[PDB]
Amino acid sequence: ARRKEFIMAELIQTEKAYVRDLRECMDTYLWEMTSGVEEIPPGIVNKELIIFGNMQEIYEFHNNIFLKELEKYEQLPEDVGHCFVTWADKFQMYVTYCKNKPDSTQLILEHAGSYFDEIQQRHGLANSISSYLIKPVQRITKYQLLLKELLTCCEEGKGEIKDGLEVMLSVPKRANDAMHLSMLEGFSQGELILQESFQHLFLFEMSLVFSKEVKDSSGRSKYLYKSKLFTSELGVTEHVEGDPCKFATSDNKIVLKASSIENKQDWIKHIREVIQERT
């Protein structure tokens, strides 16, 4: 129970620090761009939406809703999982943030020069703009670790912790999946369930897309679309002959090879999910 109090205190205090961090970033770096006195580089002028992404939407969520909700469960650590479940929909905004991040970074390093470093010096700020801008990415990835710690000092049959944990593993997974999807070249329609490389695959609700990782003439690494299959053909084989997992009236033509045993288990379960869904 003492362990439980420490975990809950950390969750709440780091939530407060996170909200403060977002507020500081918007009060300083953002405000200087929109309303500041000093000259702004021509390459970043009026591009605050690219640089800061949907930070304001994220701040509003945590400041208006999520921190208040967490503080309500302050002495009910067993039941805090429900909070993440209830507000699961709002965390989708982190997919938007993460997808935009590479564009923010590029705009800063190529066009901002020392503009933000000067603001940092002037405001006596410990954190650089890049330090603030990574914080939502770190945060969305920390919730699951805190929920895991709670899960361990609680017992089976009492929580909703597990349900909250499931949600908070799903959000960064979806953000990560979306980054991979944006790399697809040569290829609505349906929700992305899994992505992974085999012998790169994108499994949607009603489509199964095969790709090959290559580099552009510009040197940009991406996935070249090769082939696609609809919802029908399933092949359940886990074992070969002392090797990793390989799977598919049917023939031997269909060969898919996963790296680990756990990853193999995922795809089987998840393809079957949308075989019964489409029928």
Partner: protein
């Protein structure tokens, strides 16, 4: 005074967060080890030369291969960490961490760090590994891995006792200076 950005990477079992908390904090092993280490910045003295050392943890990002590189741009030095009592984490240095870091950061120095040095001689730990036909990672094996991945330095440390801890970060700074 130049600023240095140092990013700590490695498997979840490695104790990245503990390492950072132990380094930055007085009287480290408290009743509770925190899950979150927020981005840290402080002036450190190395060989009579002040530097602003920036430290970023990556704990929690181990399963998200497109989220991790969001932290990489402008990194001056990486700590690639493995646990000396986890052969799995050691294998992921060559199979996962090195390839990834070198892909995004071709010319950035790497310090290879073996963590949990205090457990290497722990009877119960050795026995638990023995049951899996495994052995703790020895110093020569670590050195060999460092040369294999072109690390500027191989170092071993314990977050718990703080043995070797200061040297890790001194050497990370020296790799940049």
């Amino acid at each position: 005074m130049q600023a240095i950005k140092c990013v700590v990477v490695g498997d979840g079992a490695v104790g990245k967060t503990c390492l950072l908390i132990s380094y930055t904090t007085n009287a480290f092993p408290g009743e509770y080890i925190p899950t979150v280490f927020d981005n840290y910045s402080a002036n450190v003295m190395v060989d009579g030369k002040p530097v602003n050392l920036g430290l970023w943890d990556t704990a929690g990002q181990e399963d998200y291969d497109r989220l991790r590189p969001l932290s990489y741009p402008q990194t001056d030095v990486f700590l690639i960490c493995f646990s000396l009592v986890s052969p799995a984490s050691f294998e992921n240095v060559r199979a996962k961490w090195y390839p990834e870091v070198r892909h995004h950061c071709p010319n950035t120095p790497i310090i290879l760090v073996g963590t949990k040095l205090d457990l290497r001689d722990d009877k119960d730990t050795i026995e638990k590994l023995k049951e899996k036909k495994l052995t703790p990672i020895t110093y020569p094996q670590g050195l060999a891995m460092a040369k294999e991945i072109g690390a500027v330095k191989y170092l071993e440390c314990s977050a718990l006792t703080q043995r070797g801890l200061k040297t890790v970060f001194d050497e990370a700074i020296r790799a940049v200076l």
